[PDB]
Amino acid sequence: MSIGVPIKVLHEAEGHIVTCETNTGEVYRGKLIEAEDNMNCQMSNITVTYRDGRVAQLEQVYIRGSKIRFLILPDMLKNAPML
Amino acid sequence: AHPPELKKFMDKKLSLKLNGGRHVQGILRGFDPFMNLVIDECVEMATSGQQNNIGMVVIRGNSIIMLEALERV
Amino acid sequence: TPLYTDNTANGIALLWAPRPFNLRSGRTRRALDIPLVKNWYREHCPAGQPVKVRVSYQKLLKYYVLNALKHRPPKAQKKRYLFRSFKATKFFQSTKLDWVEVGLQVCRQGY
Amino acid sequence: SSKMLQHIDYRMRCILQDGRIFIGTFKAFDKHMNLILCDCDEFRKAEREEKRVLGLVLLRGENLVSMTVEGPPPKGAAGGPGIGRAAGRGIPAG
RNA sequence: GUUUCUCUUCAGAUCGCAUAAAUCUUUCGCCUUUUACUAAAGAUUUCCGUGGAGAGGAACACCAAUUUUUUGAGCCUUGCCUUGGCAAGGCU
């Protein structure tokens, strides 16, 4: 089906290191493992910034798709054969 | 396919962070295509850190905004 | 659609046919150029045949090898059509005639 | 589609749902109005004002309110047979 | 637009799934002599044909039920910020 260009670039992003910010204001920064077509991400080895300042480290995390409101994909992808 | 790839996480011990600033911690065994979870040995983490025990619970899919492992896959 | 059709048995067999028969399309050749008997003498024929022919086989290979060895590519010489240059001139005309009529004429002329 | 497609590769300013602003060079969009912005700035508002930098931002479609343009993009007949040469004229007799 | 005929230009190509002859330089051989030869090499040309491109003529012609788009909205109180608003927090 027409799953367009952005979600393909999301699959292309896997196995790198992405930053990912949720509705509430928590900022995650983690290594990606898999990402689904509705943007459910799994993420590994994270350094999370809380809304009010504090840092924490985490083992592994799974982030529901509709709860995101940007990712920061790693810049080298601008060359990729999707584009 | 439509189901979440949540198969890994099963029977390992999860924390969840739920809509509205609520927290629960769990040993997991459920999922369906909406991510409706069925959690076991489920503790409720109240604001004050006064903790409750409660039995097996369903969660609505849309209420989740993170799903974290307290002991690894 | 059926697993096989009547042409399927025949059509597979073309794939290992010799060089002019294994293709759907090609380009036409001159009657001069097709070597009809070439496939026979290129194979070492069964020795029970008389002595006379065996050496005749072998001496056919000699001229074959020499030609293909001493072959040089064409020199890219510029095209110049003889009979076109003739028929462009008032002294020549053209017509359609039986080969046997022309053959007698060439012998009469040459005489 | 066709109105959106006109914008491609320009430098686009987006206003998010929470009031934030992004400004970015624009190369993807999708049936849910997902976006990929590139070479991008996060920008907020004497009333104080501030400008943060982000890379290759992927915007889940739900957030978008509006987008606007303000930049230009981050981007015969053959020779014939005639020859000239020097010549004299030469007058004819008479 | 398909065929045809003619001309120009380039050919790298099994220009050819085929295969001729000539000249010269040498090594040979029958050999009075010379052609005509022999049979190997090399440099060469001639001839039978060919392809690509161009010019011109002629002849016939669809879904509002959690995962995005039919909305958890909206309302207050504290601190700072000259103000504006920001950091939030609390509600229904």
Side-chain angles (χ1 to χ4, degrees), chain C residues 19 27 29-30 33 35 38 67 70 74 79-80 84:
Chain C
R19 190 267 176 281
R27 198 178 178 108
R29 296 180 70 185
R30 306 184 300 173
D33 301 324
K38 200 165 189 174
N67 283 357
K70 291 308 305 268
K79 315 202 299 278
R80 45 183 158 74
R84 296 191 198 159

mmCIF file of all heavy atoms in Angstrom, chain C residues 19 27 29-30 33 35 38 67 70 74 79-80 84, chain E residues 6 9-10 15 17-20 42 47-48 50-51:
data_model
loop_
_atom_site.group_PDB
_atom_site.id
_atom_site.type_symbol
_atom_site.label_atom_id
_atom_site.label_comp_id
_atom_site.label_asym_id
_atom_site.label_seq_id
_atom_site.Cartn_x
_atom_site.Cartn_y
_atom_site.Cartn_z
ATOM 1 N N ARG C 19 22.409 -23.633 -33.929
ATOM 2 C CA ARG C 19 22.410 -22.163 -33.971
ATOM 3 C C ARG C 19 21.343 -21.454 -34.825
ATOM 4 O O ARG C 19 20.865 -20.398 -34.377
ATOM 5 C CB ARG C 19 23.831 -21.723 -34.369
ATOM 6 C CG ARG C 19 24.206 -20.218 -34.275
ATOM 7 C CD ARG C 19 23.998 -19.404 -35.566
ATOM 8 N NE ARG C 19 24.284 -17.980 -35.408
ATOM 9 C CZ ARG C 19 23.474 -17.091 -34.848
ATOM 10 N NH1 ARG C 19 22.328 -17.450 -34.296
ATOM 11 N NH2 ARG C 19 23.832 -15.811 -34.824
ATOM 12 N N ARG C 27 18.680 -12.498 -38.921
ATOM 13 C CA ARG C 27 18.862 -11.678 -40.101
ATOM 14 C C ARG C 27 19.214 -12.617 -41.241
ATOM 15 O O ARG C 27 19.922 -13.606 -41.035
ATOM 16 C CB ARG C 27 19.946 -10.629 -39.868
ATOM 17 C CG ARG C 27 19.908 -9.497 -40.848
ATOM 18 C CD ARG C 27 20.953 -8.463 -40.549
ATOM 19 N NE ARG C 27 20.916 -7.416 -41.557
ATOM 20 C CZ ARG C 27 20.461 -6.192 -41.333
ATOM 21 N NH1 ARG C 27 20.223 -5.759 -40.105
ATOM 22 N NH2 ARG C 27 20.308 -5.358 -42.356
ATOM 23 N N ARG C 29 20.764 -14.318 -44.559
ATOM 24 C CA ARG C 29 22.108 -14.516 -45.078
ATOM 25 C C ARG C 29 22.052 -14.751 -46.580
ATOM 26 O O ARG C 29 20.998 -15.036 -47.152
ATOM 27 C CB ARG C 29 22.788 -15.683 -44.358
ATOM 28 C CG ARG C 29 23.000 -15.413 -42.881
ATOM 29 C CD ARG C 29 23.683 -16.571 -42.180
ATOM 30 N NE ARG C 29 25.074 -16.725 -42.578
ATOM 31 C CZ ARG C 29 25.856 -17.718 -42.176
ATOM 32 N NH1 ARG C 29 25.390 -18.710 -41.437
ATOM 33 N NH2 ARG C 29 27.132 -17.729 -42.548
ATOM 34 N N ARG C 30 23.214 -14.648 -47.212
ATOM 35 C CA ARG C 30 23.352 -15.060 -48.598
ATOM 36 C C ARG C 30 23.433 -16.574 -48.678
ATOM 37 O O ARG C 30 23.906 -17.233 -47.747
ATOM 38 C CB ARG C 30 24.607 -14.472 -49.241
ATOM 39 C CG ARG C 30 24.766 -12.979 -49.158
ATOM 40 C CD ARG C 30 26.006 -12.564 -49.914
ATOM 41 N NE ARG C 30 27.203 -13.193 -49.369
ATOM 42 C CZ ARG C 30 28.407 -13.106 -49.919
ATOM 43 N NH1 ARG C 30 28.613 -12.413 -51.026
ATOM 44 N NH2 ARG C 30 29.429 -13.733 -49.344
ATOM 45 N N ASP C 33 26.821 -18.163 -48.089
ATOM 46 C CA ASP C 33 27.506 -18.146 -46.809
ATOM 47 C C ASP C 33 27.170 -19.312 -45.901
ATOM 48 O O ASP C 33 27.990 -19.628 -45.046
ATOM 49 C CB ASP C 33 27.197 -16.847 -46.067
ATOM 50 C CG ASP C 33 27.624 -15.618 -46.839
ATOM 51 O OD1 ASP C 33 28.671 -15.671 -47.516
ATOM 52 O OD2 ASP C 33 26.905 -14.599 -46.764
ATOM 53 N N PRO C 35 27.187 -22.849 -44.606
ATOM 54 C CA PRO C 35 27.934 -24.084 -44.885
ATOM 55 C C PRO C 35 27.198 -25.371 -44.507
ATOM 56 O O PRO C 35 27.323 -25.853 -43.375
ATOM 57 C CB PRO C 35 29.219 -23.865 -44.081
ATOM 58 C CG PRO C 35 28.758 -23.075 -42.875
ATOM 59 C CD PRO C 35 27.567 -22.268 -43.304
ATOM 60 N N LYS C 38 29.053 -28.454 -42.981
ATOM 61 C CA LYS C 38 30.153 -28.124 -42.069
ATOM 62 C C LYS C 38 30.148 -28.962 -40.792
ATOM 63 O O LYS C 38 31.220 -29.320 -40.285
ATOM 64 C CB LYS C 38 30.136 -26.637 -41.722
ATOM 65 C CG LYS C 38 31.485 -26.160 -41.205
ATOM 66 C CD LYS C 38 31.597 -24.660 -41.195
ATOM 67 C CE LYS C 38 33.006 -24.228 -40.881
ATOM 68 N NZ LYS C 38 33.185 -22.760 -41.000
ATOM 69 N N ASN C 67 42.027 -20.518 -42.141
ATOM 70 C CA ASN C 67 41.179 -19.365 -42.438
ATOM 71 C C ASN C 67 40.860 -18.570 -41.175
ATOM 72 O O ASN C 67 41.027 -17.344 -41.143
ATOM 73 C CB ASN C 67 39.888 -19.824 -43.118
ATOM 74 C CG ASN C 67 40.092 -20.173 -44.576
ATOM 75 O OD1 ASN C 67 41.187 -20.020 -45.114
ATOM 76 N ND2 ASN C 67 39.036 -20.655 -45.224
ATOM 77 N N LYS C 70 44.154 -16.847 -39.661
ATOM 78 C CA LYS C 70 44.698 -15.716 -40.395
ATOM 79 C C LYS C 70 43.672 -14.634 -40.681
ATOM 80 O O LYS C 70 44.010 -13.692 -41.409
ATOM 81 C CB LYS C 70 45.323 -16.185 -41.720
ATOM 82 C CG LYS C 70 46.617 -17.014 -41.607
ATOM 83 C CD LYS C 70 47.751 -16.405 -40.749
ATOM 84 C CE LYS C 70 48.180 -14.982 -41.164
ATOM 85 N NZ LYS C 70 49.309 -14.992 -42.131
ATOM 86 N N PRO C 74 37.751 -6.429 -40.804
ATOM 87 C CA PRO C 74 37.651 -5.498 -41.936
ATOM 88 C C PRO C 74 38.188 -4.104 -41.639
ATOM 89 O O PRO C 74 38.004 -3.561 -40.550
ATOM 90 C CB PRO C 74 36.150 -5.472 -42.234
ATOM 91 C CG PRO C 74 35.526 -5.816 -40.960
ATOM 92 C CD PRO C 74 36.416 -6.791 -40.295
ATOM 93 N N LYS C 79 32.388 2.710 -48.397
ATOM 94 C CA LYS C 79 31.446 2.054 -49.294
ATOM 95 C C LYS C 79 31.410 2.716 -50.666
ATOM 96 O O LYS C 79 31.362 3.944 -50.780
ATOM 97 C CB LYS C 79 30.042 2.110 -48.691
ATOM 98 C CG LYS C 79 29.969 1.776 -47.213
ATOM 99 C CD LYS C 79 28.573 1.327 -46.807
ATOM 100 C CE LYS C 79 27.539 2.412 -47.055
ATOM 101 N NZ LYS C 79 27.514 3.405 -45.943
ATOM 102 N N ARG C 80 31.426 1.890 -51.712
ATOM 103 C CA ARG C 80 31.348 2.381 -53.086
ATOM 104 C C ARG C 80 30.712 1.297 -53.951
ATOM 105 O O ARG C 80 31.305 0.243 -54.198
ATOM 106 C CB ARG C 80 32.720 2.837 -53.606
ATOM 107 C CG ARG C 80 33.912 1.927 -53.330
ATOM 108 C CD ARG C 80 35.205 2.554 -53.852
ATOM 109 N NE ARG C 80 36.402 2.037 -53.196
ATOM 110 C CZ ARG C 80 36.932 0.836 -53.402
ATOM 111 N NH1 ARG C 80 36.450 0.009 -54.317
ATOM 112 N NH2 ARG C 80 37.988 0.463 -52.685
ATOM 113 N N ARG C 84 25.536 0.589 -58.981
ATOM 114 C CA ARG C 84 24.796 1.839 -58.833
ATOM 115 C C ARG C 84 25.424 2.955 -59.657
ATOM 116 O O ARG C 84 24.709 3.771 -60.253
ATOM 117 C CB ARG C 84 24.704 2.233 -57.362
ATOM 118 C CG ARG C 84 23.912 1.248 -56.529
ATOM 119 C CD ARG C 84 23.620 1.792 -55.148
ATOM 120 N NE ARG C 84 23.239 0.733 -54.220
ATOM 121 C CZ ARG C 84 23.313 0.837 -52.900
ATOM 122 N NH1 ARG C 84 23.685 1.964 -52.316
ATOM 123 N NH2 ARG C 84 22.996 -0.213 -52.148
ATOM 124 P P U E 6 19.733 2.057 -55.233
ATOM 125 O OP1 U E 6 20.504 1.441 -56.342
ATOM 126 O OP2 U E 6 19.740 1.431 -53.887
ATOM 127 O "O5'" U E 6 20.224 3.567 -55.077
ATOM 128 C "C5'" U E 6 20.387 4.392 -56.221
ATOM 129 C "C4'" U E 6 20.449 5.865 -55.885
ATOM 130 O "O4'" U E 6 19.277 6.304 -55.134
ATOM 131 C "C3'" U E 6 21.609 6.282 -55.004
ATOM 132 O "O3'" U E 6 22.858 6.351 -55.677
ATOM 133 C "C2'" U E 6 21.135 7.634 -54.502
ATOM 134 O "O2'" U E 6 21.268 8.618 -55.517
ATOM 135 C "C1'" U E 6 19.646 7.369 -54.276
ATOM 136 N N1 U E 6 19.350 7.031 -52.858
ATOM 137 C C2 U E 6 19.337 8.051 -51.903
ATOM 138 O O2 U E 6 19.594 9.227 -52.111
ATOM 139 N N3 U E 6 19.071 7.656 -50.617
ATOM 140 C C4 U E 6 18.783 6.383 -50.182
ATOM 141 O O4 U E 6 18.553 6.182 -48.989
ATOM 142 C C5 U E 6 18.784 5.394 -51.214
ATOM 143 C C6 U E 6 19.050 5.746 -52.475
ATOM 144 P P U E 9 31.523 11.525 -47.972
ATOM 145 O OP1 U E 9 32.725 12.370 -48.172
ATOM 146 O OP2 U E 9 31.398 10.231 -48.688
ATOM 147 O "O5'" U E 9 31.391 11.240 -46.405
ATOM 148 C "C5'" U E 9 31.461 12.314 -45.472
ATOM 149 C "C4'" U E 9 30.994 11.929 -44.085
ATOM 150 O "O4'" U E 9 29.609 11.479 -44.111
ATOM 151 C "C3'" U E 9 31.743 10.775 -43.433
ATOM 152 O "O3'" U E 9 32.985 11.151 -42.865
ATOM 153 C "C2'" U E 9 30.750 10.285 -42.396
ATOM 154 O "O2'" U E 9 30.772 11.124 -41.250
ATOM 155 C "C1'" U E 9 29.418 10.490 -43.120
ATOM 156 N N1 U E 9 28.908 9.247 -43.754
ATOM 157 C C2 U E 9 28.252 8.307 -42.973
ATOM 158 O O2 U E 9 28.152 8.366 -41.756
ATOM 159 N N3 U E 9 27.810 7.205 -43.656
ATOM 160 C C4 U E 9 27.871 6.975 -45.014
ATOM 161 O O4 U E 9 27.398 5.934 -45.472
ATOM 162 C C5 U E 9 28.501 8.015 -45.761
ATOM 163 C C6 U E 9 28.964 9.092 -45.121
ATOM 164 P P C E 10 34.172 10.071 -42.769
ATOM 165 O OP1 C E 10 35.440 10.802 -42.526
ATOM 166 O OP2 C E 10 34.037 9.198 -43.962
ATOM 167 O "O5'" C E 10 33.869 9.187 -41.471
ATOM 168 C "C5'" C E 10 33.747 9.770 -40.178
ATOM 169 C "C4'" C E 10 33.121 8.826 -39.174
ATOM 170 O "O4'" C E 10 31.774 8.461 -39.586
ATOM 171 C "C3'" C E 10 33.828 7.486 -38.995
ATOM 172 O "O3'" C E 10 34.963 7.572 -38.147
ATOM 173 C "C2'" C E 10 32.728 6.599 -38.438
ATOM 174 O "O2'" C E 10 32.551 6.837 -37.050
ATOM 175 C "C1'" C E 10 31.500 7.135 -39.176
ATOM 176 N N1 C E 10 31.058 6.346 -40.356
ATOM 177 C C2 C E 10 30.310 5.165 -40.227
ATOM 178 O O2 C E 10 30.059 4.726 -39.095
ATOM 179 N N3 C E 10 29.936 4.502 -41.352
ATOM 180 C C4 C E 10 30.232 4.986 -42.561
ATOM 181 N N4 C E 10 29.840 4.328 -43.650
ATOM 182 C C5 C E 10 30.965 6.186 -42.715
ATOM 183 C C6 C E 10 31.343 6.815 -41.604
ATOM 184 P P C E 15 34.116 -9.846 -37.566
ATOM 185 O OP1 C E 15 34.328 -10.037 -39.018
ATOM 186 O OP2 C E 15 35.289 -9.584 -36.694
ATOM 187 O "O5'" C E 15 33.083 -8.645 -37.408
ATOM 188 C "C5'" C E 15 32.156 -8.338 -38.442
ATOM 189 C "C4'" C E 15 31.616 -6.940 -38.317
ATOM 190 O "O4'" C E 15 32.543 -5.989 -38.880
ATOM 191 C "C3'" C E 15 30.323 -6.692 -39.063
ATOM 192 O "O3'" C E 15 29.200 -7.141 -38.323
ATOM 193 C "C2'" C E 15 30.340 -5.176 -39.290
ATOM 194 O "O2'" C E 15 29.816 -4.494 -38.162
ATOM 195 C "C1'" C E 15 31.843 -4.873 -39.376
ATOM 196 N N1 C E 15 32.311 -4.501 -40.741
ATOM 197 C C2 C E 15 32.283 -5.277 -41.919
ATOM 198 O O2 C E 15 31.819 -6.416 -41.954
ATOM 199 N N3 C E 15 32.777 -4.757 -43.068
ATOM 200 C C4 C E 15 33.295 -3.532 -43.095
ATOM 201 N N4 C E 15 33.773 -3.059 -44.247
ATOM 202 C C5 C E 15 33.355 -2.731 -41.927
ATOM 203 C C6 C E 15 32.861 -3.255 -40.805
ATOM 204 P P C E 17 27.912 -14.278 -39.852
ATOM 205 O OP1 C E 17 27.210 -15.108 -40.865
ATOM 206 O OP2 C E 17 27.141 -13.349 -38.980
ATOM 207 O "O5'" C E 17 28.677 -15.260 -38.868
ATOM 208 C "C5'" C E 17 29.649 -16.160 -39.369
ATOM 209 C "C4'" C E 17 29.657 -17.468 -38.618
ATOM 210 O "O4'" C E 17 29.591 -17.208 -37.182
ATOM 211 C "C3'" C E 17 28.486 -18.409 -38.920
ATOM 212 O "O3'" C E 17 28.941 -19.752 -38.807
ATOM 213 C "C2'" C E 17 27.518 -18.123 -37.787
ATOM 214 O "O2'" C E 17 26.617 -19.172 -37.518
ATOM 215 C "C1'" C E 17 28.476 -17.892 -36.630
ATOM 216 N N1 C E 17 27.895 -17.093 -35.544
ATOM 217 C C2 C E 17 27.625 -17.729 -34.327
ATOM 218 O O2 C E 17 27.868 -18.941 -34.210
ATOM 219 N N3 C E 17 27.084 -17.012 -33.320
ATOM 220 C C4 C E 17 26.832 -15.716 -33.490
ATOM 221 N N4 C E 17 26.305 -15.045 -32.466
ATOM 222 C C5 C E 17 27.107 -15.038 -34.713
ATOM 223 C C6 C E 17 27.632 -15.763 -35.706
ATOM 224 P P A E 18 28.723 -20.772 -40.020
ATOM 225 O OP1 A E 18 27.272 -21.044 -40.145
ATOM 226 O OP2 A E 18 29.666 -21.897 -39.817
ATOM 227 O "O5'" A E 18 29.172 -19.978 -41.326
ATOM 228 C "C5'" A E 18 30.525 -19.801 -41.704
ATOM 229 C "C4'" A E 18 30.574 -19.104 -43.039
ATOM 230 O "O4'" A E 18 30.395 -17.674 -42.875
ATOM 231 C "C3'" A E 18 31.857 -19.216 -43.830
ATOM 232 O "O3'" A E 18 31.978 -20.474 -44.470
ATOM 233 C "C2'" A E 18 31.726 -18.047 -44.794
ATOM 234 O "O2'" A E 18 30.793 -18.352 -45.818
ATOM 235 C "C1'" A E 18 31.099 -16.990 -43.889
ATOM 236 N N9 A E 18 32.122 -16.136 -43.264
ATOM 237 C C8 A E 18 32.551 -16.142 -41.963
ATOM 238 N N7 A E 18 33.484 -15.255 -41.712
ATOM 239 C C5 A E 18 33.694 -14.642 -42.935
ATOM 240 C C6 A E 18 34.553 -13.613 -43.359
ATOM 241 N N6 A E 18 35.413 -12.989 -42.552
ATOM 242 N N1 A E 18 34.508 -13.235 -44.655
ATOM 243 C C2 A E 18 33.654 -13.846 -45.480
ATOM 244 N N3 A E 18 32.795 -14.823 -45.195
ATOM 245 C C4 A E 18 32.866 -15.178 -43.902
ATOM 246 P P U E 19 33.354 -21.287 -44.369
ATOM 247 O OP1 U E 19 33.142 -22.608 -45.010
ATOM 248 O OP2 U E 19 33.821 -21.222 -42.962
ATOM 249 O "O5'" U E 19 34.374 -20.474 -45.278
ATOM 250 C "C5'" U E 19 34.101 -20.251 -46.654
ATOM 251 C "C4'" U E 19 34.870 -19.078 -47.200
ATOM 252 O "O4'" U E 19 34.697 -17.904 -46.372
ATOM 253 C "C3'" U E 19 36.372 -19.246 -47.287
ATOM 254 O "O3'" U E 19 36.740 -20.091 -48.366
ATOM 255 C "C2'" U E 19 36.834 -17.795 -47.398
ATOM 256 O "O2'" U E 19 36.650 -17.309 -48.716
ATOM 257 C "C1'" U E 19 35.837 -17.081 -46.476
ATOM 258 N N1 U E 19 36.358 -16.819 -45.112
ATOM 259 C C2 U E 19 37.258 -15.782 -44.917
ATOM 260 O O2 U E 19 37.678 -15.045 -45.796
ATOM 261 N N3 U E 19 37.662 -15.612 -43.616
ATOM 262 C C4 U E 19 37.280 -16.344 -42.512
ATOM 263 O O4 U E 19 37.750 -16.055 -41.407
ATOM 264 C C5 U E 19 36.348 -17.390 -42.790
ATOM 265 C C6 U E 19 35.929 -17.579 -44.043
ATOM 266 P P A E 20 38.256 -20.232 -48.889
ATOM 267 O OP1 A E 20 38.340 -21.524 -49.610
ATOM 268 O OP2 A E 20 39.233 -19.987 -47.800
ATOM 269 O "O5'" A E 20 38.383 -19.111 -50.007
ATOM 270 C "C5'" A E 20 39.648 -18.717 -50.507
ATOM 271 C "C4'" A E 20 39.480 -17.710 -51.612
ATOM 272 O "O4'" A E 20 38.626 -16.615 -51.172
ATOM 273 C "C3'" A E 20 40.730 -17.006 -52.112
ATOM 274 O "O3'" A E 20 41.483 -17.793 -53.013
ATOM 275 C "C2'" A E 20 40.147 -15.785 -52.782
ATOM 276 O "O2'" A E 20 39.544 -16.179 -54.004
ATOM 277 C "C1'" A E 20 39.031 -15.426 -51.815
ATOM 278 N N9 A E 20 39.433 -14.434 -50.796
ATOM 279 C C8 A E 20 39.372 -14.590 -49.436
ATOM 280 N N7 A E 20 39.717 -13.528 -48.753
ATOM 281 C C5 A E 20 39.986 -12.587 -49.728
ATOM 282 C C6 A E 20 40.405 -11.241 -49.668
ATOM 283 N N6 A E 20 40.635 -10.587 -48.529
ATOM 284 N N1 A E 20 40.588 -10.564 -50.827
ATOM 285 C C2 A E 20 40.358 -11.207 -51.976
ATOM 286 N N3 A E 20 39.963 -12.466 -52.157
ATOM 287 C C4 A E 20 39.764 -13.109 -50.988
ATOM 288 P P G E 42 51.907 -13.741 -38.433
ATOM 289 O OP1 G E 42 51.237 -13.644 -37.110
ATOM 290 O OP2 G E 42 51.150 -14.253 -39.604
ATOM 291 O "O5'" G E 42 52.492 -12.304 -38.791
ATOM 292 C "C5'" G E 42 53.554 -11.756 -38.026
ATOM 293 C "C4'" G E 42 54.329 -10.718 -38.794
ATOM 294 O "O4'" G E 42 55.069 -11.343 -39.877
ATOM 295 C "C3'" G E 42 53.507 -9.645 -39.489
ATOM 296 O "O3'" G E 42 53.084 -8.625 -38.604
ATOM 297 C "C2'" G E 42 54.456 -9.159 -40.570
ATOM 298 O "O2'" G E 42 55.430 -8.285 -40.017
ATOM 299 C "C1'" G E 42 55.147 -10.456 -40.971
ATOM 300 N N9 G E 42 54.556 -11.083 -42.171
ATOM 301 C C8 G E 42 53.781 -12.213 -42.269
ATOM 302 N N7 G E 42 53.466 -12.512 -43.503
ATOM 303 C C5 G E 42 54.096 -11.539 -44.266
ATOM 304 C C6 G E 42 54.131 -11.328 -45.670
ATOM 305 O O6 G E 42 53.585 -11.988 -46.559
ATOM 306 N N1 G E 42 54.896 -10.217 -46.016
ATOM 307 C C2 G E 42 55.538 -9.416 -45.109
ATOM 308 N N2 G E 42 56.235 -8.382 -45.589
ATOM 309 N N3 G E 42 55.515 -9.599 -43.807
ATOM 310 C C4 G E 42 54.790 -10.675 -43.457
ATOM 311 P P C E 47 38.357 -2.730 -54.641
ATOM 312 O OP1 C E 47 37.723 -1.862 -55.666
ATOM 313 O OP2 C E 47 38.350 -2.319 -53.216
ATOM 314 O "O5'" C E 47 37.675 -4.166 -54.750
ATOM 315 C "C5'" C E 47 37.562 -4.837 -55.995
ATOM 316 C "C4'" C E 47 37.153 -6.272 -55.796
ATOM 317 O "O4'" C E 47 38.125 -6.934 -54.943
ATOM 318 C "C3'" C E 47 35.833 -6.505 -55.083
ATOM 319 O "O3'" C E 47 34.717 -6.350 -55.938
ATOM 320 C "C2'" C E 47 36.003 -7.910 -54.534
ATOM 321 O "O2'" C E 47 35.825 -8.866 -55.569
ATOM 322 C "C1'" C E 47 37.483 -7.902 -54.143
ATOM 323 N N1 C E 47 37.741 -7.591 -52.711
ATOM 324 C C2 C E 47 37.456 -8.510 -51.683
ATOM 325 O O2 C E 47 36.948 -9.616 -51.925
ATOM 326 N N3 C E 47 37.728 -8.172 -50.404
ATOM 327 C C4 C E 47 38.275 -6.994 -50.104
ATOM 328 N N4 C E 47 38.518 -6.730 -48.821
ATOM 329 C C5 C E 47 38.587 -6.046 -51.119
ATOM 330 C C6 C E 47 38.311 -6.389 -52.381
ATOM 331 P P C E 48 33.308 -5.866 -55.342
ATOM 332 O OP1 C E 48 32.432 -5.457 -56.467
ATOM 333 O OP2 C E 48 33.608 -4.905 -54.252
ATOM 334 O "O5'" C E 48 32.681 -7.174 -54.673
ATOM 335 C "C5'" C E 48 32.422 -8.346 -55.442
ATOM 336 C "C4'" C E 48 31.884 -9.465 -54.587
ATOM 337 O "O4'" C E 48 32.909 -9.939 -53.666
ATOM 338 C "C3'" C E 48 30.719 -9.100 -53.675
ATOM 339 O "O3'" C E 48 29.462 -9.069 -54.317
ATOM 340 C "C2'" C E 48 30.794 -10.155 -52.596
ATOM 341 O "O2'" C E 48 30.245 -11.379 -53.068
ATOM 342 C "C1'" C E 48 32.302 -10.338 -52.452
ATOM 343 N N1 C E 48 32.901 -9.561 -51.338
ATOM 344 C C2 C E 48 32.771 -9.980 -50.000
ATOM 345 O O2 C E 48 32.093 -10.983 -49.722
ATOM 346 N N3 C E 48 33.329 -9.233 -49.023
ATOM 347 C C4 C E 48 34.042 -8.148 -49.318
ATOM 348 N N4 C E 48 34.600 -7.440 -48.338
ATOM 349 C C5 C E 48 34.218 -7.725 -50.659
ATOM 350 C C6 C E 48 33.642 -8.449 -51.615
ATOM 351 P P U E 50 25.300 -5.794 -48.684
ATOM 352 O OP1 U E 50 23.826 -5.872 -48.801
ATOM 353 O OP2 U E 50 26.039 -4.719 -49.387
ATOM 354 O "O5'" U E 50 25.644 -5.677 -47.129
ATOM 355 C "C5'" U E 50 25.147 -6.634 -46.200
ATOM 356 C "C4'" U E 50 25.676 -6.423 -44.799
ATOM 357 O "O4'" U E 50 27.130 -6.321 -44.828
ATOM 358 C "C3'" U E 50 25.260 -5.156 -44.073
ATOM 359 O "O3'" U E 50 23.940 -5.157 -43.559
ATOM 360 C "C2'" U E 50 26.318 -5.044 -43.000
ATOM 361 O "O2'" U E 50 26.081 -5.983 -41.962
ATOM 362 C "C1'" U E 50 27.561 -5.480 -43.771
ATOM 363 N N1 U E 50 28.314 -4.333 -44.345
ATOM 364 C C2 U E 50 29.039 -3.464 -43.527
ATOM 365 O O2 U E 50 29.099 -3.511 -42.307
ATOM 366 N N3 U E 50 29.693 -2.455 -44.188
ATOM 367 C C4 U E 50 29.736 -2.238 -45.547
ATOM 368 O O4 U E 50 30.384 -1.297 -45.999
ATOM 369 C C5 U E 50 28.998 -3.178 -46.321
ATOM 370 C C6 U E 50 28.347 -4.167 -45.711
ATOM 371 P P G E 51 23.082 -3.802 -43.619
ATOM 372 O OP1 G E 51 21.673 -4.146 -43.921
ATOM 373 O OP2 G E 51 23.820 -2.866 -44.503
ATOM 374 O "O5'" G E 51 23.167 -3.232 -42.130
ATOM 375 C "C5'" G E 51 23.295 -4.103 -41.014
ATOM 376 C "C4'" G E 51 24.052 -3.467 -39.874
ATOM 377 O "O4'" G E 51 25.461 -3.374 -40.209
ATOM 378 C "C3'" G E 51 23.680 -2.042 -39.494
ATOM 379 O "O3'" G E 51 22.499 -1.952 -38.718
ATOM 380 C "C2'" G E 51 24.927 -1.575 -38.765
ATOM 381 O "O2'" G E 51 24.980 -2.146 -37.467
ATOM 382 C "C1'" G E 51 26.016 -2.217 -39.616
ATOM 383 N N9 G E 51 26.484 -1.339 -40.701
ATOM 384 C C8 G E 51 26.336 -1.603 -42.039
ATOM 385 N N7 G E 51 26.859 -0.699 -42.811
ATOM 386 C C5 G E 51 27.399 0.216 -41.929
ATOM 387 C C6 G E 51 28.098 1.414 -42.198
ATOM 388 O O6 G E 51 28.367 1.894 -43.304
ATOM 389 N N1 G E 51 28.490 2.056 -41.032
ATOM 390 C C2 G E 51 28.234 1.594 -39.767
ATOM 391 N N2 G E 51 28.682 2.338 -38.749
ATOM 392 N N3 G E 51 27.584 0.473 -39.501
ATOM 393 C C4 G E 51 27.201 -0.169 -40.622
#
